[PDB]
Amino acid sequence: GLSDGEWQQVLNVWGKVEADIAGHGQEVLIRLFTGHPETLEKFDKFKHLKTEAEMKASEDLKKHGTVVLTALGGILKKKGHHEAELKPLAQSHATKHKIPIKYLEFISDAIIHVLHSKHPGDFGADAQGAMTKALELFRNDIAAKYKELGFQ
């Protein structure tokens, strides 16, 4: 549960991502795959990537980065009212992709890392707080649907 002030910060920060959604999306996925290599194994179409240079050179990875952040952005712009948007993602990730909630924690922190990396000194304490809460909300609502499905 975020305040309107906090949602304001979230969407303000998001304007940064929207100026270059492919570049952010790319770096988030790279941060995830290199921080936590077991995550790479869940992608049959990226599992071939061995090196970060290959990751950096992958237009399909950038493409998927765009799909992911486009989805996340759509969800964030709902300011918490994202049941319709979130339900199919929870379902596909639990039932088809089999993504444990731990990996959603991983990519949450990765987003935080990328924002600091791409905008050093421009991602303030208040901004980090709001973004972090927003990603926790996202994660928590997915976790509820995972529990429903009995998915571990």
Identify the three-state secondary structure at position 43. coil
Q: Which stretch binds ligand HEM (CB under 6 A): 5-13, 43-51, 76-84, 124-132?
A: 43-51
Q: Of 17, 47, 33, 58, nearest to 110 (Cα)?
A: 33
The binding site for nitrite consists of 64
The binding site consists of 64, 93
CB of 121 to ligand HEM, least distance (A): 25
Radius of gyration of the chain (CA): 15
Task: Pick one of 47, 87, 97, 102: the residue that binds ligand HEM (CB under 6 A).
Answer: 97
Q: Is 149 in the site for ligand HEM (CB under 6 A)?
A: no
Q: Which stretch binds ligand HEM (CB under 6 A): 8-16, 49-57, 76-84, 99-107?
A: 99-107
Question: In the complex, which residues of this chain contact ligand HEM (CB under 6 A)?
Answer: 39, 42-45, 67-68, 71-72, 89, 92-93, 97, 99, 103-104, 107
